[PDB]
Amino acid sequence: MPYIVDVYAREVLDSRGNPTVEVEVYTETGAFGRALVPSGASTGEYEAVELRDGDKDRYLGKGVLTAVNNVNEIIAPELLGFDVTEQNAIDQLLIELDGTENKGKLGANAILGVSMACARAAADFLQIPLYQYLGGFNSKTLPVPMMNIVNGGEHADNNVDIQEFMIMPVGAPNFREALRMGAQIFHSLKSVLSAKGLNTAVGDEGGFAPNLGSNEEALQTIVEAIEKAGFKPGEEVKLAMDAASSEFYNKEDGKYHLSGEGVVKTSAEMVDWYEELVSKYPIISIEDGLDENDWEGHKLLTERLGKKVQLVGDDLFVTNTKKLSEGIKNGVGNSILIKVNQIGTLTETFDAIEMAKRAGYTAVISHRSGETEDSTIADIAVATNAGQIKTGAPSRTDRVAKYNQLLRIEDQLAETAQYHGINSFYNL
Amino acid sequence: MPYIVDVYAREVLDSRGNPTVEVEVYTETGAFGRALVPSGASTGEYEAVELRDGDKDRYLGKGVLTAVNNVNEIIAPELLGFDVTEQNAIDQLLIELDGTENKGKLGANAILGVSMACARAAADFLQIPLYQYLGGFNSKTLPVPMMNIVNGGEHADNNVDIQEFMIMPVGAPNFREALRMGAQIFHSLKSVLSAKGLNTAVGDEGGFAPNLGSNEEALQTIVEAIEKAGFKPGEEVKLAMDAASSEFYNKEDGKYHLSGEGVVKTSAEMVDWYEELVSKYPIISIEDGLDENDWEGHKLLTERLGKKVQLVGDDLFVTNTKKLSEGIKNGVGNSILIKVNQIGTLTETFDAIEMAKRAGYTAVISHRSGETEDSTIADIAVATNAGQIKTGAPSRTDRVAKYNQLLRIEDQLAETAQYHGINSFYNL
Amino acid sequence: MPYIVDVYAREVLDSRGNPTVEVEVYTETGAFGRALVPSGASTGEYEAVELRDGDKDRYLGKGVLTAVNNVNEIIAPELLGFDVTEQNAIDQLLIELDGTENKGKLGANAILGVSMACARAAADFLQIPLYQYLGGFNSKTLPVPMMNIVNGGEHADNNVDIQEFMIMPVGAPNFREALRMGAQIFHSLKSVLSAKGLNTAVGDEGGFAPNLGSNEEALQTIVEAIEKAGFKPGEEVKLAMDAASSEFYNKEDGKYHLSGEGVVKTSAEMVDWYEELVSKYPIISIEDGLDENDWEGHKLLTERLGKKVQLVGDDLFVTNTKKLSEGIKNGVGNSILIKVNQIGTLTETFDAIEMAKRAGYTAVISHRSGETEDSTIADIAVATNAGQIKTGAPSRTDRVAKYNQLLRIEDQLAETAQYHGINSFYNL
Amino acid sequence: MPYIVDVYAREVLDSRGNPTVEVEVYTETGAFGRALVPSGASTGEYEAVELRDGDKDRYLGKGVLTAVNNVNEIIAPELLGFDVTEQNAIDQLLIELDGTENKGKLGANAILGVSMACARAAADFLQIPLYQYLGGFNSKTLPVPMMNIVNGGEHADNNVDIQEFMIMPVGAPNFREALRMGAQIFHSLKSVLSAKGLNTAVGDEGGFAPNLGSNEEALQTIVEAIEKAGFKPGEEVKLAMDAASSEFYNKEDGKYHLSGEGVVKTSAEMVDWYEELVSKYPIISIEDGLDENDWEGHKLLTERLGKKVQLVGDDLFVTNTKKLSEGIKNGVGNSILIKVNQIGTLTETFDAIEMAKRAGYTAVISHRSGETEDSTIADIAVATNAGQIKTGAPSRTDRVAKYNQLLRIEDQLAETAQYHGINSFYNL
Numbered sequence A, B, C, D: 001m002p003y004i005v006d007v008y009a010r011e012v013l014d015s016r017g018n019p020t021v022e023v024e025v026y027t028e029t030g031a032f033g034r035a036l037v038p039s040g041a042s043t044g045e046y047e048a049v050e051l052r053d054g055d056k057d058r059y060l061g062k063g064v065l066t067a068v069n070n071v072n073e074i075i076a077p078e079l080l081g082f083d084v085t086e087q088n089a090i091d092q093l094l095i096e097l098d099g100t101e102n103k104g105k106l107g108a109n110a111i112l113g114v115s116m117a118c119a120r121a122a123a124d125f126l127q128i129p130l131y132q133y134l135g136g137f138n139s140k141t142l143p144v145p146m147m148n149i150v151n152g153g154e155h156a157d158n159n160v161d162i163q164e165f166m167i168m169p170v171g172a173p174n175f176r177e178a179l180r181m182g183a184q185i186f187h188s189l190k191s192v193l194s195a196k197g198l199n200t201a202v203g204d205e206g207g208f209a210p211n212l213g214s215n216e217e218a219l220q221t222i223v224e225a226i227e228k229a230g231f232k233p234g235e236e237v238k239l240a241m242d243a244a245s246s247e248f249y250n251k252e253d254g255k256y257h258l259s260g261e262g263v264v265k266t267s268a269e270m271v272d273w274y275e276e277l278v279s280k281y282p283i284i285s286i287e288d289g290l291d292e293n294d295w296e297g298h299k300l301l302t303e304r305l306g307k308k309v310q311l312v313g314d315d316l317f318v319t320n321t322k323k324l325s326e327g328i329k330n331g332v333g334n335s336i337l338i339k340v341n342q343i344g345t346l347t348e349t350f351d352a353i354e355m356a357k358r359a360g361y362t363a364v365i366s367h368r369s370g371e372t373e374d375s376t377i378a379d380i381a382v383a384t385n386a387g388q389i390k391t392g393a394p395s396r397t398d399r400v401a402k403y404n405q406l407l408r409i410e411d412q413l414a415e416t417a418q419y420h421g422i423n424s425f426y427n428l
Helices: A065-079 A087-098 A108-125 A130-135 A175-195 A215-229 A267-280 A295-305 A321-329 A346-358 A376-383 A397-416 B065-079 B087-098 B108-126 B130-135 B175-195 B215-229 B267-280 B295-305 B321-329 B346-358 B376-383 B397-416 C065-079 C087-098 C108-126 C130-135 C175-195 C215-229 C267-280 C295-305 C321-329 C346-358 C376-383 C397-416 D065-079 D087-098 D108-125 D130-135 D175-195 D215-229 D267-280 D295-305 D321-329 D346-358 D376-383 D397-416
Strands: A004-013 A019-027 A032-036 A147-151 A164-168 A238-242 A255-258 A263-265 A283-287 A310-313 A335-338 A362-366 A388-390 B004-013 B019-027 B032-036 B147-151 B164-168 B238-242 B255-258 B263-265 B283-287 B310-313 B335-338 B362-366 B388-390 C004-013 C019-027 C032-036 C147-151 C164-168 C238-242 C255-258 C263-265 C283-287 C310-313 C335-338 C362-366 C388-390 D004-013 D019-027 D032-036 D147-151 D164-168 D238-242 D255-258 D263-265 D283-287 D310-313 D335-338 D362-366 D388-390
Touching: A004 A065, A004 A108, A004 B397, A019 A065, A019 A108, A032 A108, A065 A087, A065 A108, A087 A108, A087 A346, A087 C397, A108 A130, A108 A346, A108 A376, A130 A376, A147 A175, A147 A215, A164 A215, A164 A283, A175 A215, A175 A397, A215 A238, A215 A267, A255 A267, A263 A267, A267 A283, A267 A295, A295 A310, A310 A321, A321 A346, A335 A346, A346 A362, A346 C346, A362 A376, A376 A388, A376 A397, A397 B004, A397 B397, A397 C087, B004 B065, B004 B108, B019 B065, B019 B108, B032 B108, B065 B087, B065 B108, B087 B108, B087 B346, B108 B130, B108 B346, B130 B376, B147 B175, B147 B215, B164 B215, B164 B283, B175 B215, B175 B397, B215 B267, B255 B267, B263 B267, B267 B283, B267 B295, B295 B310, B321 B346, B335 B346, B346 B362, B362 B376, B376 B388, B376 B397, C004 C065, C004 C108, C004 D397, C019 C065, C019 C108, C032 C108, C065 C087, C065 C108, C087 C108, C087 C346, C108 C130, C108 C346, C130 C376, C147 C175, C147 C215, C164 C215, C164 C283, C175 C215, C175 C397, C215 C267, C255 C267, C263 C267, C267 C283, C267 C295, C295 C310, C321 C346, C335 C346, C346 C362, C362 C376, C376 C388, C376 C397, C397 D004, C397 D397, D004 D065, D004 D108, D019 D065, D019 D108, D032 D108, D065 D087, D065 D108, D087 D108, D087 D346, D108 D130, D108 D346, D108 D376, D130 D376, D147 D175, D147 D215, D164 D215, D164 D283, D175 D215, D175 D397, D215 D238, D215 D267, D255 D267, D263 D267, D267 D283, D267 D295, D295 D310, D310 D321, D321 D346, D335 D346, D346 D362, D362 D376, D376 D388, D376 D397
Parallel strands: A238 A283, A283 A310, A310 A335, A335 A362, A362 A388, B238 B283, B283 B310, B310 B335, B335 B362, B362 B388, C238 C283, C283 C310, C310 C335, C335 C362, C362 C388, D238 D283, D283 D310, D310 D335, D335 D362, D362 D388
Antiparallel strands: A004 A019, A019 A032, A147 A164, A164 A238, A255 A263, B004 B019, B019 B032, B147 B164, B164 B238, B255 B263, C004 C019, C019 C032, C147 C164, C164 C238, C255 C263, D004 D019, D019 D032, D147 D164, D164 D238, D255 D263
């Protein structure tokens, strides 16, 4: 009944028209889970690697037939007859089967697919909500969403260096209202851009990449969008940024080259820069403010800004517990971006989140550029009472599907639902 | 056990960040269906009316709280105890409850949500695939995808008059390859646009709206994109257009005013235009080539081109059987765009498709601008062996969720799955 | 089936021959949970109040007939029909029914009994282990046991001021060996005491209260016992103390009066004392080292020792989140003793543990003086991966019933079971 | 469904911090029984022997790994597929498997573990109370408890020769009230001892071992405790003693050396002594009043005291039917102490009890020094309508767990429950 009778993969498509892995797990009694894997990286020295076929004459090298094959022909035979609820034991088996640090034999994408599909089949088998299967009875807290809204750096063709600007509706009483606020501000910003005669088409995360003149103009416009939606910047809505500073960091001279602003800064000057930005604009969180190897720099930024501003490691930590414990230990950051497919199992994902919490770090549950109709991360956010989530603009179903799943979960929790707004930032 | 114990609506969000209706249905035994409604029009003198709240201070007047209440407080009580497999009866009861021609009392969004939730719950109760529940044992033919790739007219800010340009992979052996072909052509097109220094952010349907100089610069660029993707334009890939000619049609003088083409043409000239467009480019299909009321021109259009070119009525028929029949009787068009939420029930949807078939017309199952993670239309297309579907670029999950469902359907069908390619056009 | 058909209380007896509450819960389908409540305090201005009958002629005023009636005649009728897996909702309903801050109307004993019986019935309904029902899939870490071994202060009639001395087997590879180490050290200690011609009858918690001459004669004797048991003091076994310093704290003069030590010290000197005690003996943890209101001294204590020594608040926080948070904000302590019956519901218990974790504080799951055959706290400790537990000497089934449950839990966990030893102290 | 699919043992801990056997039995349909074995003897010429590992470097030689191994690797394979309800057939198989008189190959502790776990699984499988599975429909009589209260001889360090003094609340209307009486007298005695400045810590059975001056002082103090609890010595509460006279018997000179009283007595003088004690104090029962081999002596004691006082053989009979039939036949004693683990199967235990009854002897169901959270003996007492039970002071859960189980059983029997007080002594 809980025993697995079938594990099955197929190739499907992600939100950007690229192949990805989908996995189905069935028990003897017909309990069913289906999971789809978001896009990752096939290389990267500290993260689980996704396996791609590399056949240039098929999906531009991005096929995942090998990965699908791995699930059907290597992983499946080992799982037949396993108790679908032994999540930890399943994850250890997957890790062992592969036998490498970065899951590069079977593929991070094969492994996560199975890891998630079993969890979903288990929750279906026990007939309980996924967030509750994952988290136990006390999973009840809806996250504050970091909603992508304006794009820069490598994600645009404009004069903005910051890669992303986001809004966080911290002043909402519940998640349902949080979402309406995000959505209204999004439609407000669209009208503001359209008035300036700027492009309002969208990128991967459902946000805009208009041709703004500078970082601060981007910030000013967003604040304007908020006011015109009828909300208060600061009190009701904070900003969040992903600087992706590795992208303008020069490894050669150890400095930051802001083409947008037309200046070159040291790590120390970057910290002065952020401090100024934060005093002018209601920014509550800054992601990858300094290069991924600028350990000395991150230490200074955290010392300077760590108690009034969330400091999120993305490329810094790469969802890697060795990196995380190094930051914790060296007073680096106070928050980690959690990408399930960058670590490769639900078990390892939950251990990572636990380590973050215990150090007083927030764990922000994250989308990837290539997403799918899967909403598992919404359930993960609630299972761990994480408090924050980053899954994009309130546009494109690859993003909005998560938001919808959070509405479902909040509705289902009814009067037990919580939403902590500004107080979700326990790191502050 | 097949009897309905609960019908439940909630407000969720579509792929454009606008609210829409989600409906859930349960039987006594726990059979379950969930449906989401795509974005229809609140007016339009001939199409079923979507009910919007119109509250200026909530979602910019686009809330669906009234429709959601209608489901929960009016429809639900009338459905408890109903055998969930009585789709026809259920649809009749919904229509009768509303009491109006255009479904404006309860809302077409409320009604369709219930109509689809019931069918999805029924397939679940019987434990058969939805396409099979909908169409019986012989549901087996995958649709040729009409994939949006470039936008103009009201859908863009360029010098292009045609509203949308689509590719149709008529030369693929199965849907899976059809889909790969579309994806590879889409990435090729993007590479090309990027080369010309044009914008590659996407619109509502997942396609590009670059600043192209002309209707034919658009067509030429798509041909080039196809060619560079490694496929034969004409033989393996055809083009389809949605002229949306209503937009540039001048009421006062009954002539057509193309800002982009920089001329003005009579109806007879439009046909001359299409004719020449068809002679220069591998265009297999044209949608709304003339005004949604210029019936006489449509009749000339069909006379001139109906034998070798598919002529689709979207705004012309409005998924309305009474309008379709007048089309059929007057020799107008050879194809109809089928929008479930434009009519309001699965029953009426299926009756329009049947009508179309008996007249030698193709029925193209269509998305809306605002979509969801819902993938019912993919099942509807296979259920009816329609042979064609229009659900977007292969980018954005609101579109790709439908393609993925078709992959699952094809995969389940196995050796019995069909794909007719160019032979899908039995109207030609 | 998950719906509750019966909630039933009876009066039973605790390990000290005092009445307490037993609650049973059944679902329609026969899912069953039974819980027994440990001994709390009838007053205490900040802790949930246990309801005692106070009848002079029945059990010396310690009957719980009123609480039992409250369960059977007030709570039960409100719970029939409730989905037994709605722990949060159930806990909320209990709290609301009582209507008071300190649970003094229905009784914390009545409320907790129902709260735990429901969770135990729920795990039974779903047929999953209780720790898993409580904590979700990732519940897997066995606690390092803090085992009572020698008593003083109000808990003895000797010249010892410290209320209790405990051993912690930090050097064991798993819980089973941890437990063996504690047992062997306990028999060794007994052999030693017996050699000195001292008494070896046990107290409420299963430990010895021999007539020792001094705080340090106690510590030295434990070290000797460890040494003679074949283990390394410091490396493999640490010591923990419950100072219960409130007891010898002189209100009138705000100084501390140690009858046994034969001196009187200021707060600054207490810290000096602990500091020196820590320098001479392998003490890893101190509980209630200063008065339950001498917040300022606690703050000095934490300043002086918090970095390398665990500082537990028992009477200081009273398992009260509002008190814990003031501790956290004021840099007071790095650990909290968690007593389920001091707060009154599993929901509130779990929220206090979560709060503690996010601040880098350890949460020690604790017994009461009066225990039962009930072993829920062992499941709670694993459910939360707390890393530590305080449930007594390895003698007396009221204590050993919890150790045995941990052995069963470890055994069930198999290869996925963890034990972190000295690394359990993430607060250090 | 009733067939055994799994028999499983593990090492757990008893109430004194010593290893013991725990056994779990599962049927094909999930019926479940868990039994824990109380401490026994690994040697003794007429009793089943418990198997201990004797590894001096592990639990001081008291491990039971061999015994656990015997269950898992030798006993389990033979029981798979057995009808769990064939108690007699299971017990015969266990006895045969071992093949020795005293169960010393497999261990008395392995065998009893299985024997009891099957019975519990069988009662669970049939969904009936254990006492009812064991005893049939007419099991309804709650026993009078012999509650340990004051300790002497080898169980103390005082001037008392008698090993134990107990109270029996014969005047209570039911068991629930019996227990409250015991408990109040226990708390009363504690205050009395505390007033004399005597130690009130507890030993193995939960009773006190204060430094009293003589046997008769012990008796006088207990009578005082009773009066001060507000009950009548004699009418409402009788005393019971376990002399354990083998402990002061000198095999060499055939006499009894009462160091406490500072006198030496012949068997005949011991009988005069008891007679005097009984005429001064409301003693109703005397256990092992003479040495285990003093057959001639026991005959005289029984002749003298057998019709007004219960005379219990413990070491005399050692739960051995050959010893019992020898006593019955030679007019020795009128009562036998029944220890399940000293005989080794439920079948043999019930046959022993039957033989006692048929001879007009009472069978007193007994605890051991090392106990556990197991309460099977409470159910045995009720299954056989034994009328008396000896499981310790109303303190320590190792004892109180039995008392609690008796409350549960009495509550469940409701109006069919009986309690015979003084009339339980059918031997008198």
